[PDB]
Nucleic acid binder design. Structure first.
Ligand SMILES: [Mg+2]
Lengths: 85, 85
DNA sequence: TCGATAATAAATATTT
DNA sequence: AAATATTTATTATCGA
């Protein structure tokens, strides 16, 4: 397919918004984007770099530590309170 | 009632995509945006100008004339095939 | 970080 | 008397 119009901030925001408890890991963000948008099933090394960049660079995305029981790869990412949600 | 992250291109694309006929008039685009995003119920004079600019400036949006037997203000807008979706 | 794209703000232009 | 459509420049923001 062709590239959808969504910015990386928009792609991440939509992924978080539909996520159980409005939290998901980086790899879950990757998977949601690829599941919904066939364009992103390729050039993964490039756009996933852009995803990681967008999560860190923008204050609207906030890191949340894993639980001590069921800890794992990466933290959860969520939306900052003074966005819309 | 906070500003959603979506670009004007993304807002228009989403509005058209959800239309039963896959086409919307300009005023229908305005209404869909305002219905879904309360933020856009203000400053309509500004962002609706931006909507019109985005519709004309981008080739992914293509104008479709009303039938001669059903005239009115403005044409229908839809997504062009030569732009993916 | 640097190159690309979006968006704000107009005047202009078309049409009902 | 208006909604709609096109166009240009500039500022802001995005993204490779
Ligand atoms: Mg967007």
């Amino acid at each position: 397919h062709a590239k959808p119009p969504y910015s990386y901030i928009s792609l991440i925001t939509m992924a978080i918004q539909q996520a159980p408890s409005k939290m998901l890991t980086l790899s879950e963000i990757y998977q949601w984007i690829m599941d919904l948008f066939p364009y992103y099933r390729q050039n993964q090394q490039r756009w996933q770099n852009s995803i990681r960049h967008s999560l860190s660079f923008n204050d609207c995305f906030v890191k949340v530590a894993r639980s001590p029981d069921k800890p794992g790869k990466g933290s959860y990412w969520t939306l900052h309170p003074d966005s819309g949600n």
